[PDB]
């Protein structure tokens, strides 16, 4: 109870005095105070207006164009400290174009902890020459006090009143001249002995406690301070906040629960109206410092395992990605706060480019929509996407929506990828190359489709395999649909592969830069019914020696009569070209 009343937030009071009464119970303003643009106010409006409870402002005080106000002596009689934690253009105190202000009269103002004073263009303003600012600010060098009545030869500043010129206000030197120091005709400037430093003193000249700032009711007692030099707790001024408290806004001690209440879910307002408070080095602060991220269950900043997660808050809660350039805008993002719309119709090396820019996204808080993305064969470029929350949904309550994607054959590889969808429904329409099995797998994993695709079906087997150091010769089963008539084509795929990790729907072949070497194999000639296995084959040439090749065959995509089938694909076989004979390794070794 050093500040008995409320702690209020910063305020911005304009036009009318109505909202000003919101300050009536504040002991401390935790923020700034701006009072401005009151053109219709007159002295009578301020005669019976007072906020004697206000002791301190943590940021700055600004007064601009407030008509009728002639002094601040009745408005803020007890304002003792302006901390200047945040400033107005390096200023902690701003008095500007206060037409009618005759004196400041802030007779209890002892300390301005940080920042400077700007008092400018106050045409009636006097009692400025009588203030010794060196008692209030450590450096007066940056003060800007000009264009006031005081500049001319019209101020009749008078401090003496009781006896007049016989033992009244303290006097201090400017350069060589002693000047009596006062705020008004009835109020002296308080000056303490030098041993008191900034702590203040009683009327009898006895020093306040070293934890006090500016003034106290009793000497050398940290429970009797008007304001604190360091931190405030339970009517006491302390050097540091003791356990279990945290340092808050560089002036008070708060408990975990307070910090927790601030943090909690300021639903929308990310852009100036939330922060989400965290704990770091016994401080409750707006956000984690660089190199730290927030451990969620206890609000505690912990150092990042590698680079820090990066939350990208989208404008209006959405973003449409229709190019490599727009995707780049999300490079480095690990969390999307909002929803994504994918609309990619063309380009080059898209799977790699999209994976580079979007491959780190682990979570999307809203929905994901893929629509008219003609160029996409897979959504695997979203390499790390594990969660879609569905906190926002597409009209019809959809969290995942896929519409009119003409080449989409894969969502994610459900043998490896896990994706969770907390809320909302799925929508799939006009995805002609996407089998319903992939959609059904997604439903399982997550908690007009495929009509132009025949989905794996039959198995072609290799009847023959032959290696050369530079070549591979293969044969495989002939394919014959129900009505054996008009068989036209095979397709052989081969890539240089390491071990195991090879798939058909790999690194989006799409249109351009390809992940697979491809051969069109002409359909064979049957040559009657008895012994018609004139096994289609191929001679691979242009291969590196001692190299493993992922290889598989497919039968060209046939719109069949009645129950439609394209046919068969072979399994992925790995074939390693020949290398050196042991004998031949030996030779080259054994003979220079």
């Amino acid at each position: 109870h050093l500040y008995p009343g409320e702690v209020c937030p910063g305020m911005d009071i304009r036009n009318n005095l109505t909202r000003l009464h919101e300050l009536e119970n504040c002991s401390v303003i935790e923020g700034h105070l701006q009072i401005l643009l009151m053109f219709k106010t007159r002295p009578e409006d301020f005669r019976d207006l007072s906020f004697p409870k206000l002791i301190m402002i943590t940021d700055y005080l600004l007064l601009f164009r407030v008509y009728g106000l002639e002094s601040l002596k009745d408005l803020f009689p007890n304002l003792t400290v302006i901390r200047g934690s945040r400033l107005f253009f390096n200023y902690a105190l701003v008095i500007f174009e206060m037409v009618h202000l005759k004196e400041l009269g802030l007779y209890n103002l002892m300390n301005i902890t940080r920042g400077s004073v700007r008092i400018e263009k106050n045409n009636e303003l006097c009692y400025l020459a009588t203030i010794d600012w060196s008692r209030i600010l450590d450096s007066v060098e940056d003060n800007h006090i000009v264009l006031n009545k005081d500049d001319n030869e019209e101020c009749g500043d008078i401090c003496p009143g009781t006896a007049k010129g016989k033992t009244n206000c303290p006097a201090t030197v400017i350069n060589g001249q002693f000047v009596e120091r006062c705020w008004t005709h009835s109020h002296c400037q308080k000056v303490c002995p030098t041993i008191c430093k900034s702590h203040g003193c009683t009327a009898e000249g006895l020093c306040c406690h070293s934890e006090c700032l500016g003034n106290c009711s009793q000497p050398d007692d940290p429970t009797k301070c008007v304001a604190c030099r360091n931190f405030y707790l339970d009517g006491r001024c302390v050097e540091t906040c003791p356990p279990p408290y945290y340092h808050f806004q560089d002036w008070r001690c708060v408990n975990f629960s307070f910090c927790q209440d601030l943090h909690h879910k300021c639903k929308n307002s990310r852009r100036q109206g939330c922060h989400q408070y965290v704990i770091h080095n016994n401080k409750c602060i707006p956000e984690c410092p660089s190199g730290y991220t927030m451990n969620s269950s206890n609000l505690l900043c912990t150092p990042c395992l590698g680079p820090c997660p990066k939350v990208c808050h989208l404008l209006e809660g959405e973003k449409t990605i229709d190019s490599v350039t727009s995707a780049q805008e999300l490079r480095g993002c690990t969390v999307i706060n909002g929803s994504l719309i994918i609309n990619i119709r063309g380009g080059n090396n898209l799977a790699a480019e999209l994976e580079a820019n979007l491959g780190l996204i682990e979570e999307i808080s809203g929905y994901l929509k893929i629509r008219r993305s003609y160029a996409l064969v897979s959504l695997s470029f979203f390499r790390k996407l594990r969660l879609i929350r569905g906190e926002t949904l597409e009209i019809g309550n959809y969290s995942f929506y896929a519409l009119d994607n003409q080449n989409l054959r894969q969502l994610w590889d459900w043998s490896k990828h896990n994706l969770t969808i907390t809320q909302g429904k799925l929508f799939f329409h006009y995805n002609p190359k996407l089998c319903l099995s992939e959609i059904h797998k997604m439903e399982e994993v997550s908690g007009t489709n495929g009509d132009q695709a025949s989905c794996e079906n039959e198995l072609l087997k290799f009847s023959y395999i032959r290696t050369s150091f530079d070549k591979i010769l293969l044969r495989w089963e002939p394919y014959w649909p129900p009505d054996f008539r008009d068989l036209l084509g095979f397709m052989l795929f081969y890539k240089e592969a390491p071990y195991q990790n090879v798939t058909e729907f790999d690194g989006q072949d799409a249109c351009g830069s390809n992940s697979w070497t491809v051969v069109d194999i002409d359909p064979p000639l049957r040559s009657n019914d008895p012994k018609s296995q004139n096994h289609p084959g191929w001679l691979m040439r242009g291969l590196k020696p001692w190299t493993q090749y992922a290889i598989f065959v497919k039968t060209l995509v046939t719109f069949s009569d009645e129950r439609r089938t394209y046919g068969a694909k072979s399994d992925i076989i790995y074939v390693q070209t020949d290398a050196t004979t042991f004998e031949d390794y030996l030779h080259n070794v054994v003979f220079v």
């Binding site: 009318n16 643009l37 053109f39 164009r65 174009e97």
Partner: peptide, 17 residues
Amino acid sequence: HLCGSHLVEALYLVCGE
């Protein structure tokens, strides 16, 4: 045309709050 202190004044002519 419009400037300095006059902007404040110009705006009040218009505002009339």
